[PDB]
């Protein structure tokens, strides 16, 4: 994940109960953007939390994954209005929480979702 | 909140186990307008009871929220068979309930909530 | 209501946990017309069961309830690749549920769900 | 059922709890064709399982089944982008599950997810 320095695991962070998008946020800096702030709730939490992450960022993880496992484990990835991102974002969440434990628990997903630099509120 | 005399809180009203836009209902006086009734569940309670909000009522509400809070903690506010403001002040709701607890529960909202004027069946 | 002759309710017949519309079907007499298979699953009960309404039987119904009731107490109601009737009815059957309990356990609903000739599988 | 040696039961193979269409995948021989990846999750499991049916078995499943069954028992069938079999045969299978138990549970649609040939990861 070349957006997140170390890599961590569902061990160290806490199994995740609830996912979803949550809105869409718009970007300056660098360039005009929207970014997904995304709504995490793990297991014995009661206050969700929130970390933000692009749509190139969501697609890289798909990449990555898709190098580790056939594609027939993950689920279809996506290729302003464009707010659609949002509701597919999320679709693309929900199902992926829903895949056999190997890809739902991974490294990756779990790395997805750790707290970075901008996350700190 | 232009709408509502007092300020209340989650403290004196009860806690918000269910929301939805119910239905949306035709006036006339003082101008031909539709009114969106929203449905509340409490905690503790079992029978429903119902308030009555405009277009321009939620919209403020959302506007008010948007001064005290950074607008990523917000969900996204949309922009008859336009009963569209129906579906989409409903998915408006849902998401404020699922935002971190000082927006969820602020005093704001808990006002939105408590029964005015025409509420009074 | 113009189609059964008793009127129920739901002391008699048992309190409603689940509806929706589950399917529709194509008729022949007296006329060609769709008819919806309304799946209904009681408290107390694990398999459900199913009556036949036609369209126009679920719109008396609602002229019915708008007679008794004020309309914002009501679900919107809706004005073949025309199965989208079958989404409507749906969503609002699922509305009708959450009504007050006024409206939802009322006579008029408890009969329009009540078995009929036809039912009678 | 033209794709499955033996017919099975849910005796011996085990209730479904959850079943979904999770993602569609693209073959290759014996000629280009979209293979639906079934998710099935039984009573007594936490990780669920995966089968792969086209679109041409989903139909003779319910061809199959609407031999045994009058039509008022079945769910609707519906009649690449048209990756809306994905959404359609979803609710196809959801539907399914929801009908009376002796179609539910019936031996042609516990053998429709039954692990084949190619279910063998």
Redesign the interface.
Same mark, same amino acid.
């Given at each position: 994940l070349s957006f997140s320095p170390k890599t961590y695991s569902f061990r160290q962070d806490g199994r995740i109960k609830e996912v979803?998008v949550?809105?869409?946020? $718009?970007k300056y800096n660098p360039d005009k953007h929207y970014i997904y702030?995304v709504?995490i709730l793990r297991e014995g939490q009661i206050?969700?939390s929130?970390v933000?992450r692009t749509f190139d960022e969501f697609q890289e993880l798909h990449n990555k994954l898709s190098i580790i496992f056939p594609?027939? $484990?993950?689920?279809?990835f996506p290729n302003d209005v464009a707010?659609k991102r949002?509701i597919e974002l999320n679709s693309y969440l929900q199902?992926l929480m829903?895949?056999?434990?190997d890809v739902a628990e991974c490294d990756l997903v779990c790395t997805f979702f750790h707290p970075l630099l901008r996350d700190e509120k």
């Amino acid at each position: 994940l070349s957006f997140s320095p170390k890599t961590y695991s569902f061990r160290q962070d806490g199994r995740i109960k609830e996912v979803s998008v949550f809105t869409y946020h $718009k970007k300056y800096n660098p360039d005009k953007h929207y970014i997904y702030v995304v709504r995490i709730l793990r297991e014995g939490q009661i206050e969700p939390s929130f970390v933000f992450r692009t749509f190139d960022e969501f697609q890289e993880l798909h990449n990555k994954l898709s190098i580790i496992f056939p594609l027939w $484990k993950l689920p279809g990835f996506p290729n302003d209005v464009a707010a659609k991102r949002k509701i597919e974002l999320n679709s693309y969440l929900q199902s992926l929480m829903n895949a056999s434990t190997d890809v739902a628990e991974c490294d990756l997903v779990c790395t997805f979702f750790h707290p970075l630099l901008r996350d700190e509120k």
